[PDB]
Amino acid sequence: KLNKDAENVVKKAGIDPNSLTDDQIKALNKMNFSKAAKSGTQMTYNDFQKIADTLIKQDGRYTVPFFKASEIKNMPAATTKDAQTNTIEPLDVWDSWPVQDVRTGQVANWNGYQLVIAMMGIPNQNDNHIYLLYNKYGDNELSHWKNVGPIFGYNSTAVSQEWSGSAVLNSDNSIQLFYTRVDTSDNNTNHQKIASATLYLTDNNGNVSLAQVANDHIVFEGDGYYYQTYDQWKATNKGADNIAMRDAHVIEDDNGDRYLVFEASTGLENYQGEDQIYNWLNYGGDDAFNIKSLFRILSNDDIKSRATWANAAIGILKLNKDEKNPKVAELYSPLISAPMVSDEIERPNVVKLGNKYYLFAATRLNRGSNDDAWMNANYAVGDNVAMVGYVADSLTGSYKPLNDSGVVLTASVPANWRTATYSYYAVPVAGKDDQVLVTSYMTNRNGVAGKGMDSTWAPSFLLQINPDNTTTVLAKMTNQGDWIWDDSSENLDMIGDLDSAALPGERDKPVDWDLIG
Ligand SMILES: [Ca+2]
Ligand SMILES: [Ca+2]
Ligand SMILES: [Ca+2]
């Protein structure tokens, strides 16, 4: 027998109570219909489903543009002396970020150079380290980039790794780097910590060198209430829980505060668990959608499991005033969270446009709980990646999803093609308040697209940011690896179509199942 709340929602859904099984009835009687939202905004089960639906539709407003596949090359600077082996090798290059102006997010001009920090490593090896690259500011040629080498030096190992973050210019023209320090000494686990160091560079006759790395230290690795700690994860992980404490994005607000916006999972404030399946807030559709979703969740062990472990978070904390030796001043509740919905939302990024703050992130939809949604994405397109987006009136204020569901970009080609992309990272555009340039890496790692095909820098493309909290992808593309949009940067030749996006035979190529899930 249904309680009265369960009975209310069943009738509003326009389904007959007698058609419900005993297992279904007892599920509805567990439902918690009155949990007050924690601070911030959730990607709900309905939001996730709409994002995937939009991806399946391949609507030109949100689809990542087709890139002309003939044009795609390995990045010369990704052939470099490897941080671990100490030998010159052609490396995968993936997650990358430019040094930016801490206030505006514009790509910084350091003594006439643009500077990018990048994850690189040998395909099919555990080789995760970051490298500093440079080129003349405004230069548009992939091949003019040069690799200064690994920030943390040669003779490195997989026991201590560097994953992604951000970088800005300090007031004295040194660089403050935020990155992910990963310690794998505890049984090879990816123990992630947000770290920071100051980089001192020098410039001699067209060459930029890394003179010194100072003040390298851990900033934050979770508190337990707002964000999940390594100990918490380890306490309950049997192989189904993600661990995330990474991808820290530094930005300074109008009030002179530096913040980190970062990737994590929620803590005890609103923790993962089987109870989240029974928190009505997490669903976010009408009654009929919500009930159908509950029943689907319960009918599949995988989905139930995923829902039980899902609690991705985009966090924020305020740093203290020391530019070069940052520590946490205040922790806040996540800006965005996805309890029940996804256990992985990465590369959070904030861009200020006018008086608004746009929060973007990359995600692979196959890390969400709704297996039907992401498998349908894979079936329709051959990939499940997206960029999501929100907007707020202040850096810490309430973020509202863009384009209804939060969808911003959707995958347009199969994951194992040369022109597949991930790790979308938007950079503002000089003298434009309604556009950002979307950068990404191209070709998925570890040789999945074929012989000699390394992860490289994608051509970048403009995304228009509209005043009504929507976005529109524009048919404006650059060369590979362009971080700076201007009137010199357009290269319309790079834009492909559904056909030219593919090398010969890729349309009929066998799917890489491990890759797409
Ligand atoms: Ca060294
Ligand atoms: Ca989790
Ligand atoms: Ca450019």
Side-chain angles (χ1 to χ4, degrees):
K1 288 198 156 159
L2 296 162
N3 66 50
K4 62 153 174 51
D5 284 324
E7 199 86 57
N8 296 150
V9 297
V10 167
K11 59 191 192 100
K12 284 192 280 184
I15 199 61
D16 169 46
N18 285 223
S19 66
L20 300 175
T21 64
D22 271 308
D23 286 330
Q24 286 173 336
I25 286 159
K26 68 169 196 195
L28 290 164
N29 297 338
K30 292 163 139 291
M31 185 58 54
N32 181 344
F33 296 97
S34 60
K35 212 148 190 294
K38 94 189 146 285
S39 187
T41 297
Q42 291 180 46
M43 174 189 285
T44 62
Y45 199 78
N46 189 245
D47 290 329
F48 186 101
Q49 176 76 68
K50 297 190 188 155
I51 291 153
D53 284 350
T54 297
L55 178 156
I56 293 151
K57 283 171 195 169
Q58 281 147 104
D59 186 333
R61 294 184 292 167
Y62 319 112
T63 48
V64 170
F66 291 119
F67 303 98
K68 191 182 283 166
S70 47
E71 311 308 284
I72 302 304
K73 24 171 308 206
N74 294 331
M75 179 168 199
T79 297
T80 193
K81 185 170 176 186
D82 179 74
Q84 294 183 166
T85 66
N86 305 338
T87 63
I88 293 83
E89 299 219 21
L91 307 181
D92 280 333
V93 58
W94 60 109
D95 292 5
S96 306
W97 56 101
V99 177
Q100 308 171 262
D101 178 291
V102 77
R103 278 147 265 99
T104 80
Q106 302 281 339
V107 177
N109 188 333
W110 187 83
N111 297 149
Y113 300 95
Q114 55 183 320
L115 302 167
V116 170
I117 303 186
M119 284 185 78
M120 295 185 178
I122 299 160
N124 295 112
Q125 299 253 290
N126 192 326
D127 183 21
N128 300 304
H129 299 279
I130 51 178
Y131 297 72
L132 175 60
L133 297 94
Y134 70 100
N135 192 356
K136 294 270 161 192
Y137 188 94
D139 180 294
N140 293 322
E141 316 221 49
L142 179 66
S143 66
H144 293 164
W145 288 89
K146 290 189 271 171
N147 200 323
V148 184
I151 305 300
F152 289 98
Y154 298 103
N155 283 306
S156 295
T157 78
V159 167
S160 191
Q161 315 180 8
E162 303 93 42
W163 309 350
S164 301
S166 60
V168 299
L169 289 185
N170 290 321
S171 303
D172 76 337
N173 227 42
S174 67
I175 289 175
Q176 204 61 28
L177 169 76
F178 294 90
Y179 73 98
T180 308
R181 173 57 63 193
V182 188
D183 161 22
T184 67
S185 62
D186 182 20
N187 197 27
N188 300 324
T189 63
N190 292 316
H191 188 165
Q192 294 151 62
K193 310 167 169 162
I194 296 168
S196 189
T198 305
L199 322 180
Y200 296 98
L201 312 187
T202 65
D203 143 40
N204 181 337
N205 179 39
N207 301 306
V208 172
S209 299
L210 183 50
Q212 195 53 41
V213 181
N215 317 306
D216 184 42
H217 66 290
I218 305 315
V219 175
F220 187 60
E221 65 167 286
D223 60 300
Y225 174 80
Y226 294 117
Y227 306 100
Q228 183 191 59
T229 66
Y230 173 81
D231 287 335
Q232 277 170 328
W233 171 77
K234 195 207 180 165
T236 53
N237 186 47
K238 298 177 223 77
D241 200 19
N242 198 19
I243 172 168
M245 179 46 63
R246 62 172 184 259
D247 300 6
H249 183 84
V250 72
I251 183 172
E252 192 196 321
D253 72 2
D254 315 298
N255 282 30
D257 299 322
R258 290 191 176 182
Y259 292 78
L260 297 179
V261 175
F262 60 94
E263 178 182 358
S265 305
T266 56
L268 297 181
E269 183 189 32
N270 185 23
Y271 205 42
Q272 59 197 21
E274 189 172 319
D275 285 358
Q276 291 296 350
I277 293 171
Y278 304 101
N279 292 349
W280 193 249
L281 275 189
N282 295 332
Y283 289 81
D286 60 33
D287 306 295
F289 175 91
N290 288 359
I291 295 180
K292 182 188 71 183
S293 295
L294 169 68
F295 294 163
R296 180 63 183 126
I297 287 170
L298 291 174
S299 74
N300 179 300
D301 299 324
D302 193 57
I303 294 169
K304 178 184 200 198
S305 168
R306 293 184 171 238
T308 295
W309 292 105
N311 67 332
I314 300 179
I316 183 167
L317 58 78
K318 199 176 41 180
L319 290 173
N320 74 346
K321 300 299 294 232
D322 197 335
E323 254 177 40
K324 298 194 176 162
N325 198 8
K327 299 213 171 60
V328 178
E330 210 174 317
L331 292 184
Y332 311 84
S333 305
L335 300 182
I336 301 293
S337 61
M340 211 191 74
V341 183
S342 182
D343 214 23
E344 196 176 85
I345 304 171
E346 335 169 285
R347 308 227 44 214
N349 178 35
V350 177
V351 74
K352 181 176 188 52
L353 301 166
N355 55 33
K356 289 188 166 206
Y357 287 102
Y358 292 86
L359 171 57
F360 305 103
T363 187
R364 294 183 181 277
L365 298 173
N366 69 8
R367 310 290 199 279
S369 63
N370 188 340
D371 288 350
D372 293 326
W374 65 256
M375 289 176 187
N376 284 333
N378 285 342
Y379 188 68
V381 170
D383 204 351
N384 54 79
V385 307
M387 192 181 75
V388 300
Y390 309 81
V391 62
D393 84 320
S394 66
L395 193 46
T396 61
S398 165
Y399 284 79
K400 307 295 181 76
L402 300 173
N403 308 302
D404 180 47
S405 58
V407 68
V408 174
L409 304 172
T410 59
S412 55
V413 303
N416 62 347
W417 288 14
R418 184 57 163 146
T419 58
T421 52
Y422 185 56
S423 210
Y424 308 105
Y425 189 84
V427 177
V429 175
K432 277 291 209 290
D433 66 353
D434 68 333
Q435 290 174 356
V436 304
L437 180 66
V438 176
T439 72
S440 60
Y441 80 87
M442 173 168 286
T443 313
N444 276 295
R445 288 163 62 192
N446 302 315
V448 296
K451 171 193 203 301
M453 293 175 173
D454 305 330
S455 296
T456 187
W457 286 352
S460 308
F461 60 92
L462 289 179
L463 175 69
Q464 183 171 292
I465 312 304
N466 308 315
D468 66 340
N469 294 353
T470 63
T471 62
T472 308
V473 169
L474 297 179
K476 299 301 202 162
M477 191 170 292
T478 74
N479 297 331
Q480 284 183 258
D482 191 351
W483 299 85
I484 300 156
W485 178 266
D486 54 36
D487 295 316
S488 71
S489 289
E490 182 161 9
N491 178 358
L492 273 210
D493 195 51
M494 300 295 286
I495 303 183
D497 53 31
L498 195 20
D499 194 285
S500 54
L503 294 168
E506 282 189 318
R507 306 183 97 72
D508 310 326
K509 197 164 70 133
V511 173
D512 184 310
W513 293 105
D514 280 17
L515 174 56
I516 65 156

mmCIF file of all heavy atoms in Angstrom, residues 43-73:
data_model
loop_
_atom_site.group_PDB
_atom_site.id
_atom_site.type_symbol
_atom_site.label_atom_id
_atom_site.label_comp_id
_atom_site.label_asym_id
_atom_site.label_seq_id
_atom_site.Cartn_x
_atom_site.Cartn_y
_atom_site.Cartn_z
ATOM 1 N N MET A 43 22.977 19.170 -11.533
ATOM 2 C CA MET A 43 22.635 18.562 -12.799
ATOM 3 C C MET A 43 21.755 17.405 -12.373
ATOM 4 O O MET A 43 22.234 16.457 -11.716
ATOM 5 C CB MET A 43 23.889 18.058 -13.511
ATOM 6 C CG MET A 43 23.626 17.272 -14.791
ATOM 7 S SD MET A 43 25.125 16.499 -15.409
ATOM 8 C CE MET A 43 25.996 17.884 -16.116
ATOM 9 N N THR A 44 20.461 17.499 -12.692
ATOM 10 C CA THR A 44 19.486 16.474 -12.321
ATOM 11 C C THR A 44 19.451 15.347 -13.353
ATOM 12 O O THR A 44 20.111 15.438 -14.395
ATOM 13 C CB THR A 44 18.067 17.061 -12.208
ATOM 14 O OG1 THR A 44 17.635 17.579 -13.481
ATOM 15 C CG2 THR A 44 18.027 18.187 -11.192
ATOM 16 N N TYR A 45 18.678 14.296 -13.062
ATOM 17 C CA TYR A 45 18.574 13.146 -13.943
ATOM 18 C C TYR A 45 17.894 13.600 -15.237
ATOM 19 O O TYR A 45 18.275 13.175 -16.337
ATOM 20 C CB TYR A 45 17.831 11.979 -13.266
ATOM 21 C CG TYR A 45 18.049 10.603 -13.874
ATOM 22 C CD1 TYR A 45 19.200 9.892 -13.615
ATOM 23 C CD2 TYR A 45 17.084 10.010 -14.696
ATOM 24 C CE1 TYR A 45 19.408 8.624 -14.148
ATOM 25 C CE2 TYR A 45 17.281 8.748 -15.235
ATOM 26 C CZ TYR A 45 18.448 8.056 -14.965
ATOM 27 O OH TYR A 45 18.662 6.799 -15.478
ATOM 28 N N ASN A 46 16.936 14.501 -15.093
ATOM 29 C CA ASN A 46 16.300 15.089 -16.268
ATOM 30 C C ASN A 46 17.271 15.932 -17.127
ATOM 31 O O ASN A 46 17.256 15.842 -18.367
ATOM 32 C CB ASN A 46 15.083 15.922 -15.851
ATOM 33 C CG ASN A 46 14.271 16.364 -17.040
ATOM 34 O OD1 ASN A 46 14.169 17.548 -17.323
ATOM 35 N ND2 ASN A 46 13.722 15.413 -17.753
ATOM 36 N N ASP A 47 18.120 16.729 -16.469
ATOM 37 C CA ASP A 47 19.130 17.508 -17.175
ATOM 38 C C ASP A 47 20.056 16.616 -17.984
ATOM 39 O O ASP A 47 20.335 16.885 -19.161
ATOM 40 C CB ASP A 47 19.990 18.344 -16.208
ATOM 41 C CG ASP A 47 19.232 19.490 -15.588
ATOM 42 O OD1 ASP A 47 18.324 20.017 -16.268
ATOM 43 O OD2 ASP A 47 19.544 19.856 -14.429
ATOM 44 N N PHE A 48 20.542 15.554 -17.348
ATOM 45 C CA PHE A 48 21.469 14.625 -17.981
ATOM 46 C C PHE A 48 20.801 13.998 -19.200
ATOM 47 O O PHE A 48 21.401 13.936 -20.260
ATOM 48 C CB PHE A 48 21.909 13.549 -16.984
ATOM 49 C CG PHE A 48 22.974 12.621 -17.497
ATOM 50 C CD1 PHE A 48 24.296 12.803 -17.130
ATOM 51 C CD2 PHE A 48 22.655 11.578 -18.339
ATOM 52 C CE1 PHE A 48 25.295 11.951 -17.608
ATOM 53 C CE2 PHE A 48 23.642 10.727 -18.817
ATOM 54 C CZ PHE A 48 24.960 10.912 -18.462
ATOM 55 N N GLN A 49 19.571 13.515 -19.039
ATOM 56 C CA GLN A 49 18.844 12.908 -20.141
ATOM 57 C C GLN A 49 18.683 13.907 -21.325
ATOM 58 O O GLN A 49 18.844 13.518 -22.481
ATOM 59 C CB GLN A 49 17.468 12.426 -19.689
ATOM 60 C CG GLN A 49 16.630 11.858 -20.822
ATOM 61 C CD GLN A 49 17.061 10.481 -21.241
ATOM 62 O OE1 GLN A 49 16.907 9.548 -20.487
ATOM 63 N NE2 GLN A 49 17.586 10.338 -22.452
ATOM 64 N N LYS A 50 18.360 15.166 -21.030
ATOM 65 C CA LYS A 50 18.224 16.170 -22.073
ATOM 66 C C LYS A 50 19.557 16.478 -22.770
ATOM 67 O O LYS A 50 19.595 16.685 -23.977
ATOM 68 C CB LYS A 50 17.643 17.472 -21.543
ATOM 69 C CG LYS A 50 16.251 17.378 -21.005
ATOM 70 C CD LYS A 50 15.765 18.776 -20.755
ATOM 71 C CE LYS A 50 14.438 18.803 -20.034
ATOM 72 N NZ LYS A 50 14.296 20.093 -19.291
ATOM 73 N N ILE A 51 20.642 16.531 -22.011
ATOM 74 C CA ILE A 51 21.965 16.705 -22.613
ATOM 75 C C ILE A 51 22.246 15.571 -23.637
ATOM 76 O O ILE A 51 22.682 15.826 -24.773
ATOM 77 C CB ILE A 51 23.104 16.773 -21.546
ATOM 78 C CG1 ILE A 51 22.992 18.067 -20.739
ATOM 79 C CG2 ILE A 51 24.475 16.665 -22.205
ATOM 80 C CD1 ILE A 51 23.554 17.971 -19.340
ATOM 81 N N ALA A 52 22.013 14.331 -23.224
ATOM 82 C CA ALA A 52 22.237 13.192 -24.094
ATOM 83 C C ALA A 52 21.303 13.230 -25.312
ATOM 84 O O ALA A 52 21.732 12.937 -26.425
ATOM 85 C CB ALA A 52 22.043 11.911 -23.338
ATOM 86 N N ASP A 53 20.039 13.586 -25.080
ATOM 87 C CA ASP A 53 19.059 13.712 -26.168
ATOM 88 C C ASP A 53 19.504 14.738 -27.198
ATOM 89 O O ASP A 53 19.474 14.463 -28.395
ATOM 90 C CB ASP A 53 17.676 14.060 -25.609
ATOM 91 C CG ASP A 53 16.998 12.866 -24.992
ATOM 92 O OD1 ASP A 53 17.481 11.726 -25.141
ATOM 93 O OD2 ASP A 53 16.015 13.054 -24.308
ATOM 94 N N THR A 54 19.990 15.880 -26.722
ATOM 95 C CA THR A 54 20.520 16.922 -27.582
ATOM 96 C C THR A 54 21.721 16.400 -28.376
ATOM 97 O O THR A 54 21.802 16.591 -29.594
ATOM 98 C CB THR A 54 20.879 18.181 -26.755
ATOM 99 O OG1 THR A 54 19.694 18.714 -26.163
ATOM 100 C CG2 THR A 54 21.536 19.240 -27.587
ATOM 101 N N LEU A 55 22.629 15.705 -27.710
ATOM 102 C CA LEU A 55 23.765 15.097 -28.409
ATOM 103 C C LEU A 55 23.287 14.150 -29.509
ATOM 104 O O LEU A 55 23.789 14.191 -30.636
ATOM 105 C CB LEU A 55 24.667 14.354 -27.432
ATOM 106 C CG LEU A 55 25.882 13.599 -27.977
ATOM 107 C CD1 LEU A 55 26.940 13.432 -26.891
ATOM 108 C CD2 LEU A 55 25.542 12.270 -28.602
ATOM 109 N N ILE A 56 22.309 13.304 -29.192
ATOM 110 C CA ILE A 56 21.769 12.351 -30.187
ATOM 111 C C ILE A 56 21.172 13.083 -31.411
ATOM 112 O O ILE A 56 21.363 12.656 -32.552
ATOM 113 C CB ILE A 56 20.721 11.426 -29.539
ATOM 114 C CG1 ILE A 56 21.415 10.508 -28.526
ATOM 115 C CG2 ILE A 56 19.967 10.613 -30.587
ATOM 116 C CD1 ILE A 56 20.504 10.084 -27.386
ATOM 117 N N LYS A 57 20.495 14.199 -31.167
ATOM 118 C CA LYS A 57 19.926 15.035 -32.239
ATOM 119 C C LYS A 57 20.938 15.713 -33.154
ATOM 120 O O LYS A 57 20.619 16.028 -34.286
ATOM 121 C CB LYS A 57 18.999 16.117 -31.650
ATOM 122 C CG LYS A 57 17.652 15.577 -31.250
ATOM 123 C CD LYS A 57 16.814 16.582 -30.480
ATOM 124 C CE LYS A 57 15.656 15.855 -29.802
ATOM 125 N NZ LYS A 57 14.922 16.704 -28.825
ATOM 126 N N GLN A 58 22.145 15.962 -32.669
ATOM 127 C CA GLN A 58 23.202 16.553 -33.495
ATOM 128 C C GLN A 58 22.729 17.894 -34.065
ATOM 129 O O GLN A 58 22.802 18.158 -35.266
ATOM 130 C CB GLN A 58 23.613 15.609 -34.616
ATOM 131 C CG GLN A 58 24.547 14.511 -34.185
ATOM 132 C CD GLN A 58 24.330 13.242 -34.965
ATOM 133 O OE1 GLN A 58 25.118 12.929 -35.848
ATOM 134 N NE2 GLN A 58 23.264 12.481 -34.628
ATOM 135 N N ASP A 59 22.195 18.701 -33.169
ATOM 136 C CA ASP A 59 21.739 20.033 -33.466
ATOM 137 C C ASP A 59 22.943 20.949 -33.657
ATOM 138 O O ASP A 59 23.765 21.088 -32.755
ATOM 139 C CB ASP A 59 20.888 20.514 -32.308
ATOM 140 C CG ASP A 59 20.248 21.842 -32.562
ATOM 141 O OD1 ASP A 59 20.795 22.631 -33.351
ATOM 142 O OD2 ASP A 59 19.220 22.120 -31.917
ATOM 143 N N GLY A 60 23.035 21.571 -34.837
ATOM 144 C CA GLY A 60 24.137 22.469 -35.194
ATOM 145 C C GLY A 60 24.399 23.601 -34.226
ATOM 146 O O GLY A 60 25.505 24.126 -34.193
ATOM 147 N N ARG A 61 23.411 23.963 -33.415
ATOM 148 C CA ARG A 61 23.629 24.946 -32.367
ATOM 149 C C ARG A 61 24.660 24.506 -31.306
ATOM 150 O O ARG A 61 25.347 25.362 -30.750
ATOM 151 C CB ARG A 61 22.316 25.293 -31.656
ATOM 152 C CG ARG A 61 21.316 25.998 -32.535
ATOM 153 C CD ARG A 61 20.115 26.375 -31.712
ATOM 154 N NE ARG A 61 19.341 25.214 -31.275
ATOM 155 C CZ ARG A 61 18.394 25.266 -30.330
ATOM 156 N NH1 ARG A 61 18.107 26.414 -29.708
ATOM 157 N NH2 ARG A 61 17.734 24.166 -29.977
ATOM 158 N N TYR A 62 24.767 23.198 -31.053
ATOM 159 C CA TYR A 62 25.613 22.654 -29.998
ATOM 160 C C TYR A 62 26.675 21.677 -30.460
ATOM 161 O O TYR A 62 27.620 21.408 -29.715
ATOM 162 C CB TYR A 62 24.766 21.938 -28.975
ATOM 163 C CG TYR A 62 23.497 22.655 -28.644
ATOM 164 C CD1 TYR A 62 22.282 22.134 -29.016
ATOM 165 C CD2 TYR A 62 23.523 23.867 -27.959
ATOM 166 C CE1 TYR A 62 21.110 22.790 -28.698
ATOM 167 C CE2 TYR A 62 22.365 24.554 -27.693
ATOM 168 C CZ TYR A 62 21.171 23.993 -28.040
ATOM 169 O OH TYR A 62 20.001 24.638 -27.730
ATOM 170 N N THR A 63 26.560 21.129 -31.663
ATOM 171 C CA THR A 63 27.537 20.142 -32.108
ATOM 172 C C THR A 63 28.908 20.775 -32.279
ATOM 173 O O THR A 63 29.051 21.891 -32.802
ATOM 174 C CB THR A 63 27.156 19.459 -33.447
ATOM 175 O OG1 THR A 63 26.769 20.456 -34.397
ATOM 176 C CG2 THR A 63 26.026 18.493 -33.245
ATOM 177 N N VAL A 64 29.906 20.046 -31.796
ATOM 178 C CA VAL A 64 31.278 20.381 -32.053
ATOM 179 C C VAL A 64 31.388 20.325 -33.574
ATOM 180 O O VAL A 64 30.977 19.323 -34.193
ATOM 181 C CB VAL A 64 32.252 19.398 -31.404
ATOM 182 C CG1 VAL A 64 33.671 19.624 -31.893
ATOM 183 C CG2 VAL A 64 32.178 19.500 -29.886
ATOM 184 N N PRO A 65 31.950 21.383 -34.181
ATOM 185 C CA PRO A 65 32.057 21.424 -35.655
ATOM 186 C C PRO A 65 32.838 20.263 -36.204
ATOM 187 O O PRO A 65 33.686 19.681 -35.512
ATOM 188 C CB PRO A 65 32.819 22.725 -35.946
ATOM 189 C CG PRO A 65 32.939 23.446 -34.683
ATOM 190 C CD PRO A 65 32.422 22.614 -33.535
ATOM 191 N N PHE A 66 32.562 19.912 -37.459
ATOM 192 C CA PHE A 66 33.348 18.896 -38.129
ATOM 193 C C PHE A 66 34.672 19.534 -38.522
ATOM 194 O O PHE A 66 34.702 20.653 -39.033
ATOM 195 C CB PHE A 66 32.619 18.391 -39.369
ATOM 196 C CG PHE A 66 31.374 17.596 -39.075
ATOM 197 C CD1 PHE A 66 30.127 18.019 -39.530
ATOM 198 C CD2 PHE A 66 31.450 16.414 -38.365
ATOM 199 C CE1 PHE A 66 28.977 17.273 -39.282
ATOM 200 C CE2 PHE A 66 30.298 15.665 -38.095
ATOM 201 C CZ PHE A 66 29.062 16.090 -38.572
ATOM 202 N N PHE A 67 35.751 18.816 -38.277
ATOM 203 C CA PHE A 67 37.090 19.243 -38.629
ATOM 204 C C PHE A 67 37.485 18.467 -39.868
ATOM 205 O O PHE A 67 37.230 17.280 -39.952
ATOM 206 C CB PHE A 67 38.064 18.912 -37.485
ATOM 207 C CG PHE A 67 37.662 19.516 -36.167
ATOM 208 C CD1 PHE A 67 36.979 18.774 -35.218
ATOM 209 C CD2 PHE A 67 37.943 20.850 -35.890
ATOM 210 C CE1 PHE A 67 36.602 19.354 -34.006
ATOM 211 C CE2 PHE A 67 37.572 21.433 -34.687
ATOM 212 C CZ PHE A 67 36.908 20.688 -33.738
ATOM 213 N N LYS A 68 38.104 19.144 -40.826
ATOM 214 C CA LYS A 68 38.624 18.490 -42.016
ATOM 215 C C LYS A 68 39.823 17.615 -41.651
ATOM 216 O O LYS A 68 40.903 18.100 -41.317
ATOM 217 C CB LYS A 68 38.978 19.531 -43.082
ATOM 218 C CG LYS A 68 39.293 18.966 -44.453
ATOM 219 C CD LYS A 68 39.687 20.076 -45.417
ATOM 220 C CE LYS A 68 38.475 20.857 -45.920
ATOM 221 N NZ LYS A 68 38.864 22.135 -46.595
ATOM 222 N N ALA A 69 39.612 16.302 -41.732
ATOM 223 C CA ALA A 69 40.564 15.321 -41.235
ATOM 224 C C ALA A 69 41.927 15.298 -41.923
ATOM 225 O O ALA A 69 42.918 14.985 -41.268
ATOM 226 C CB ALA A 69 39.958 13.929 -41.299
ATOM 227 N N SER A 70 41.972 15.605 -43.229
ATOM 228 C CA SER A 70 43.240 15.666 -43.986
ATOM 229 C C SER A 70 44.244 16.645 -43.393
ATOM 230 O O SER A 70 45.454 16.475 -43.539
ATOM 231 C CB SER A 70 42.982 16.076 -45.441
ATOM 232 O OG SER A 70 42.112 17.192 -45.536
ATOM 233 N N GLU A 71 43.736 17.665 -42.702
ATOM 234 C CA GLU A 71 44.569 18.736 -42.189
ATOM 235 C C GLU A 71 45.215 18.397 -40.857
ATOM 236 O O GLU A 71 46.112 19.113 -40.416
ATOM 237 C CB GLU A 71 43.738 20.024 -42.078
ATOM 238 C CG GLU A 71 42.921 20.380 -43.329
ATOM 239 C CD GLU A 71 43.762 20.395 -44.607
ATOM 240 O OE1 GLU A 71 44.501 21.352 -44.813
ATOM 241 O OE2 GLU A 71 43.662 19.452 -45.415
ATOM 242 N N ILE A 72 44.794 17.305 -40.215
ATOM 243 C CA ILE A 72 45.184 17.104 -38.817
ATOM 244 C C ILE A 72 46.561 16.480 -38.710
ATOM 245 O O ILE A 72 46.789 15.407 -39.264
ATOM 246 C CB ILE A 72 44.136 16.244 -38.037
ATOM 247 C CG1 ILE A 72 42.759 16.930 -38.114
ATOM 248 C CG2 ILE A 72 44.582 16.016 -36.589
ATOM 249 C CD1 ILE A 72 42.744 18.359 -37.600
ATOM 250 N N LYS A 73 47.447 17.148 -37.971
ATOM 251 C CA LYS A 73 48.797 16.657 -37.734
ATOM 252 C C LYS A 73 49.125 16.530 -36.264
ATOM 253 O O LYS A 73 48.506 17.174 -35.426
ATOM 254 C CB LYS A 73 49.880 17.531 -38.421
ATOM 255 C CG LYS A 73 49.516 18.977 -38.726
ATOM 256 C CD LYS A 73 50.734 19.790 -39.205
ATOM 257 C CE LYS A 73 51.937 19.673 -38.250
ATOM 258 N NZ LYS A 73 52.885 20.822 -38.255
#
